[PDB]
Design a protein around this motif. Structure first.
Motif, PDB file in Angstrom:
ATOM      1  N   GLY A  27       0.858  -1.099   0.017  1.00  0.00           N
ATOM      2  CA  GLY A  27       0.229  -0.047   0.075  1.00  0.00           C
ATOM      3  C   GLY A  27       0.861   1.292   0.082  1.00  0.00           C
ATOM      4  O   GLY A  27       0.829   2.235   0.676  1.00  0.00           O
ATOM      5  N   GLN A  28       1.710   1.275  -0.739  1.00  0.00           N
ATOM      6  CA  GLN A  28       2.688   2.488  -0.972  1.00  0.00           C
ATOM      7  C   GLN A  28       1.952   3.916  -1.005  1.00  0.00           C
ATOM      8  O   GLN A  28       2.380   4.926  -0.677  1.00  0.00           O
ATOM      9  CB  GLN A  28       3.785   2.163  -2.258  1.00  0.00           C
ATOM     10  CG  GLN A  28       4.252   3.356  -2.618  1.00  0.00           C
ATOM     11  CD  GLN A  28       5.802   3.287  -3.429  1.00  0.00           C
ATOM     12  OE1 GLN A  28       6.604   3.905  -3.073  1.00  0.00           O
ATOM     13  NE2 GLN A  28       5.711   2.760  -4.532  1.00  0.00           N
ATOM     14  N   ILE A  29       0.916   3.741  -1.579  1.00  0.00           N
ATOM     15  CA  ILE A  29      -0.129   4.601  -1.781  1.00  0.00           C
ATOM     16  C   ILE A  29      -1.255   4.596  -1.209  1.00  0.00           C
ATOM     17  O   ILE A  29      -2.179   5.321  -1.012  1.00  0.00           O
ATOM     18  CB  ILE A  29      -0.397   4.872  -3.319  1.00  0.00           C
ATOM     19  CG1 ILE A  29       0.778   4.309  -4.153  1.00  0.00           C
ATOM     20  CG2 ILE A  29      -0.663   6.550  -3.625  1.00  0.00           C
ATOM     21  CD1 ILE A  29       0.548   3.001  -4.650  1.00  0.00           C
ATOM     22  N   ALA A  30      -1.663   3.471  -0.492  1.00  0.00           N
ATOM     23  CA  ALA A  30      -3.045   3.220   0.398  1.00  0.00           C
ATOM     24  C   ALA A  30      -2.516   3.108   1.754  1.00  0.00           C
ATOM     25  O   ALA A  30      -1.387   2.703   2.083  1.00  0.00           O
ATOM     26  CB  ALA A  30      -3.563   1.972  -0.451  1.00  0.00           C
ATOM     27  N   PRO A  31      -3.627   3.084   2.457  1.00  0.00           N
ATOM     28  CA  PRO A  31      -3.638   2.922   3.921  1.00  0.00           C
ATOM     29  C   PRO A  31      -3.267   1.499   4.442  1.00  0.00           C
ATOM     30  O   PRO A  31      -2.979   1.111   5.456  1.00  0.00           O
ATOM     31  CB  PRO A  31      -4.804   3.131   4.343  1.00  0.00           C
ATOM     32  CG  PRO A  31      -5.813   2.799   3.398  1.00  0.00           C
ATOM     33  CD  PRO A  31      -5.040   3.242   1.930  1.00  0.00           C
ATOM     34  N   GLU A  32      -3.260   0.410   3.397  1.00  0.00           N
ATOM     35  CA  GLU A  32      -2.838  -0.787   3.516  1.00  0.00           C
ATOM     36  C   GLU A  32      -1.296  -0.882   4.362  1.00  0.00           C
ATOM     37  O   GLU A  32      -1.139  -1.825   5.003  1.00  0.00           O
ATOM     38  CB  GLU A  32      -2.765  -1.470   2.470  1.00  0.00           C
ATOM     39  CG  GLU A  32      -4.009  -2.130   2.253  1.00  0.00           C
ATOM     40  CD  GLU A  32      -4.275  -3.227   1.122  1.00  0.00           C
ATOM     41  OE1 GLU A  32      -4.130  -2.989  -0.076  1.00  0.00           O
ATOM     42  OE2 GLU A  32      -4.461  -4.785   1.528  1.00  0.00           O
ATOM     43  N   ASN A  33      -0.497  -0.144   3.663  1.00  0.00           N
ATOM     44  CA  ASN A  33       0.876   0.003   4.225  1.00  0.00           C
ATOM     45  C   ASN A  33       1.095   0.108   5.879  1.00  0.00           C
ATOM     46  O   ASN A  33       0.603   1.089   6.404  1.00  0.00           O
ATOM     47  CB  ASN A  33       1.694   1.274   3.702  1.00  0.00           C
ATOM     48  CG  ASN A  33       2.973   0.910   3.044  1.00  0.00           C
ATOM     49  OD1 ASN A  33       4.137   1.290   3.259  1.00  0.00           O
ATOM     50  ND2 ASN A  33       2.879   0.165   1.822  1.00  0.00           N
ATOM     51  N   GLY A  34       1.332  -1.136   6.267  1.00  0.00           N
ATOM     52  CA  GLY A  34       1.309  -1.264   7.796  1.00  0.00           C
ATOM     53  C   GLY A  34       0.392  -2.038   8.304  1.00  0.00           C
ATOM     54  O   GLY A  34       0.553  -2.361   9.719  1.00  0.00           O
ATOM     55  N   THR A  35      -0.563  -2.547   7.549  1.00  0.00           N
ATOM     56  CA  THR A  35      -1.408  -3.374   8.062  1.00  0.00           C
ATOM     57  C   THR A  35      -1.057  -4.993   7.769  1.00  0.00           C
ATOM     58  O   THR A  35      -1.449  -5.853   8.537  1.00  0.00           O
ATOM     59  CB  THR A  35      -2.905  -3.212   7.488  1.00  0.00           C
ATOM     60  OG1 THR A  35      -3.122  -1.974   7.362  1.00  0.00           O
ATOM     61  CG2 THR A  35      -3.955  -3.723   8.293  1.00  0.00           C
ATOM     62  N   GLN A  36      -0.543  -5.136   6.952  1.00  0.00           N
ATOM     63  CA  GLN A  36       0.103  -6.553   6.444  1.00  0.00           C
ATOM     64  C   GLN A  36       1.625  -6.777   6.309  1.00  0.00           C
ATOM     65  O   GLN A  36       2.164  -7.635   6.165  1.00  0.00           O
ATOM     66  CB  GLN A  36      -0.466  -6.780   4.832  1.00  0.00           C
ATOM     67  CG  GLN A  36      -1.968  -6.973   4.800  1.00  0.00           C
ATOM     68  CD  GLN A  36      -2.757  -7.792   5.739  1.00  0.00           C
ATOM     69  OE1 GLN A  36      -2.785  -7.701   6.802  1.00  0.00           O
ATOM     70  NE2 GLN A  36      -2.791  -9.182   5.162  1.00  0.00           N
ATOM     71  N   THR A  37       2.144  -5.429   6.585  1.00  0.00           N
ATOM     72  CA  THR A  37       3.668  -5.423   6.732  1.00  0.00           C
ATOM     73  C   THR A  37       4.192  -6.615   7.491  1.00  0.00           C
ATOM     74  O   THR A  37       3.445  -7.069   8.360  1.00  0.00           O
ATOM     75  CB  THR A  37       4.191  -4.056   7.498  1.00  0.00           C
ATOM     76  OG1 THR A  37       5.650  -4.216   7.715  1.00  0.00           O
ATOM     77  CG2 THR A  37       3.343  -4.114   8.591  1.00  0.00           C
ATOM     78  N   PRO A  38       5.308  -6.869   7.213  1.00  0.00           N
ATOM     79  CA  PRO A  38       5.816  -8.133   7.873  1.00  0.00           C
ATOM     80  C   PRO A  38       6.460  -7.779   9.399  1.00  0.00           C
ATOM     81  O   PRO A  38       7.899  -7.918   9.392  1.00  0.00           O
ATOM     82  CB  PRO A  38       7.221  -8.602   6.792  1.00  0.00           C
ATOM     83  CG  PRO A  38       7.525  -7.469   6.202  1.00  0.00           C
ATOM     84  CD  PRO A  38       6.045  -6.665   6.093  1.00  0.00           C
TER      85      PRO A  38
END
Length: 35
Positions: free
Chosen positions: A18-29
């Protein structure tokens, strides 16, 4: 073949995470201490 993934794998993971979406940090390793 190891020093390439360190910057390539992390880049391909942050871009699909999610480099541009809020997903960045939700599925992060996340680490085992938090996961």
């Amino acid at each position: 073949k190891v020093g390439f993934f360190k910057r390539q794998y992390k880049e391909m993971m942050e871009e699909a995470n999610g480099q541009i979406a809020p997903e960045n940090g939700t599925q992060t390793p996340s680490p085992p201490s938090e996961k």
